[PDB]
Amino acid sequence: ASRLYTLVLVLQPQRVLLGMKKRGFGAGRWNGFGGKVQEGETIEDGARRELQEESGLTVDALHKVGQIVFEFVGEPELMDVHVFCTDSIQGTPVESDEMRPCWFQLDQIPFKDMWPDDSYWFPLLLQKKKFHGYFKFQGQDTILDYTLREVDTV
Ligand SMILES: CNc1cc(N2CCCCC2)nc(N)n1
């Protein structure tokens, strides 16, 4: 059994929008916008909701670019994260109680202050290539195992 999550990356030709997580799961790291998919909504609806609630932004089209499964040692449910990117956004991003957004040049992504798995799969995102990944975590900082491949259907 897995639980569904979303991750939205606003990736423009020279910059990517990241948010500093202010509370909750993953606080203190930069990440895309997302969270749990709820009952009653599709995965992409959950992604648009979490984007609007964490950044104020709405989007015209969301594209599937990745899926990553996470196992945490001792936790029964795997996290099944559906990763989406978009180029065009509607509005300018604003802080929420959850996320502090900020633009980053593609040359200057703060991997040291992101989730560790990001160092592995973010490059395939910046290459506009579709990927499936799996990462096994012990705690929040230590990757024990991982697999990562490119796919044609995400
Ligand atoms: C565990 N490693 C993770 C987790 C994660 N989120 C995405 C939003 C919803 C929670 C999970 N994002 C990234 N980049 N790495």
UniProtKB/Swiss-Prot annotation:
<dbReference type="InterPro" id="IPR020084">
    <property type="entry name" value="NUDIX_hydrolase_CS"/>
</dbReference>
<feature type="binding site">
    <location>
        <position position="34"/>
    </location>
    <ligand>
        <name>Mg(2+) 1</name>
    </ligand>
</feature>
<keyword id="KW-0378">Hydrolase</keyword>
<dbReference type="InterPro" id="IPR015797">
    <property type="entry name" value="NUDIX_hydrolase-like_dom_sf"/>
</dbReference>
<dbReference type="GO" id="GO:0035539">
    <property type="term" value="F:8-oxo-7,8-dihydrodeoxyguanosine triphosphate pyrophosphatase activity"/>
</dbReference>
<keyword id="KW-0460">Magnesium</keyword>
<feature type="short sequence motif" description="Nudix box">
    <location>
        <begin position="35"/>
        <end position="56"/>
    </location>
</feature>
<dbReference type="GO" id="GO:0006281">
    <property type="term" value="P:DNA repair"/>
</dbReference>
<feature type="binding site">
    <location>
        <begin position="115"/>
        <end position="118"/>
    </location>
    <ligand>
        <name>8-oxo-ATP</name>
    </ligand>
</feature>
<feature type="binding site">
    <location>
        <position position="6"/>
    </location>
    <ligand>
        <name>8-oxo-dGTP</name>
    </ligand>
</feature>
<dbReference type="GO" id="GO:0008828">
    <property type="term" value="F:dATP diphosphatase activity"/>
</dbReference>
<keyword id="KW-0809">Transit peptide</keyword>
<feature type="binding site">
    <location>
        <position position="21"/>
    </location>
    <ligand>
        <name>N(6)-methyl-AMP</name>
    </ligand>
</feature>
<protein>
    <recommendedName>
        <fullName>Oxidized purine nucleoside triphosphate hydrolase</fullName>
        <ecNumber>3.6.1.56</ecNumber>
        <ecNumber>3.6.1.-</ecNumber>
    </recommendedName>
</protein>
<feature type="binding site">
    <location>
        <position position="50"/>
    </location>
    <ligand>
        <name>8-oxo-ATP</name>
    </ligand>
</feature>
<dbReference type="GO" id="GO:0005759">
    <property type="term" value="C:mitochondrial matrix"/>
</dbReference>
<keyword id="KW-0539">Nucleus</keyword>
<comment type="subunit">
    <text>Monomer.</text>
</comment>
<feature type="binding site">
    <location>
        <position position="31"/>
    </location>
    <ligand>
        <name>2-oxo-dATP</name>
    </ligand>
</feature>
<dbReference type="GO" id="GO:0016818">
    <property type="term" value="F:hydrolase activity, acting on acid anhydrides, in phosphorus-containing anhydrides"/>
</dbReference>
<feature type="binding site">
    <location>
        <position position="50"/>
    </location>
    <ligand>
        <name>Mg(2+) 2</name>
    </ligand>
</feature>
<dbReference type="GO" id="GO:0047693">
    <property type="term" value="F:ATP diphosphatase activity"/>
</dbReference>
<dbReference type="GO" id="GO:0008413">
    <property type="term" value="F:8-oxo-7,8-dihydroguanosine triphosphate pyrophosphatase activity"/>
</dbReference>
<dbReference type="GO" id="GO:0042262">
    <property type="term" value="P:DNA protection"/>
</dbReference>
<dbReference type="GO" id="GO:0030515">
    <property type="term" value="F:snoRNA binding"/>
</dbReference>
<keyword id="KW-0963">Cytoplasm</keyword>
<dbReference type="InterPro" id="IPR020476">
    <property type="entry name" value="Nudix_hydrolase"/>
</dbReference>
<feature type="binding site">
    <location>
        <begin position="33"/>
        <end position="36"/>
    </location>
    <ligand>
        <name>2-oxo-dATP</name>
    </ligand>
</feature>
<dbReference type="Pfam" id="PF00293">
    <property type="entry name" value="NUDIX"/>
</dbReference>
<feature type="binding site">
    <location>
        <begin position="33"/>
        <end position="36"/>
    </location>
    <ligand>
        <name>8-oxo-ATP</name>
    </ligand>
</feature>
<dbReference type="InterPro" id="IPR000086">
    <property type="entry name" value="NUDIX_hydrolase_dom"/>
</dbReference>
<feature type="binding site">
    <location>
        <position position="6"/>
    </location>
    <ligand>
        <name>8-oxo-dGMP</name>
    </ligand>
</feature>
<feature type="binding site">
    <location>
        <begin position="115"/>
        <end position="118"/>
    </location>
    <ligand>
        <name>O(6)-methyl-dGMP</name>
    </ligand>
</feature>
<feature type="binding site">
    <location>
        <position position="21"/>
    </location>
    <ligand>
        <name>O(6)-methyl-dGMP</name>
    </ligand>
</feature>
<comment type="function">
    <text>Oxidized purine nucleoside triphosphate hydrolase which is a prominent sanitizer of the oxidized nucleotide pool. Catalyzes the hydrolysis of 2-oxo-dATP (2-hydroxy-dATP) into 2-oxo-dAMP. Also has a significant hydrolase activity toward 2-oxo-ATP, 8-oxo-dGTP and 8-oxo-dATP. Through the hydrolysis of oxidized purine nucleoside triphosphates, prevents their incorporation into DNA and the subsequent transversions A:T to C:G and G:C to T:A. Also catalyzes the hydrolysis of methylated purine nucleoside triphosphate preventing their integration into DNA.</text>
</comment>
<keyword id="KW-0694">RNA-binding</keyword>
<feature type="binding site">
    <location>
        <position position="54"/>
    </location>
    <ligand>
        <name>Mg(2+) 1</name>
    </ligand>
</feature>
<dbReference type="GO" id="GO:0006152">
    <property type="term" value="P:purine nucleoside catabolic process"/>
</dbReference>
<feature type="binding site">
    <location>
        <position position="98"/>
    </location>
    <ligand>
        <name>Mg(2+) 1</name>
    </ligand>
</feature>
<dbReference type="GO" id="GO:0046872">
    <property type="term" value="F:metal ion binding"/>
</dbReference>
<feature type="binding site">
    <location>
        <position position="21"/>
    </location>
    <ligand>
        <name>8-oxo-dGMP</name>
    </ligand>
</feature>
<feature type="binding site">
    <location>
        <position position="31"/>
    </location>
    <ligand>
        <name>O(6)-methyl-dGMP</name>
    </ligand>
</feature>
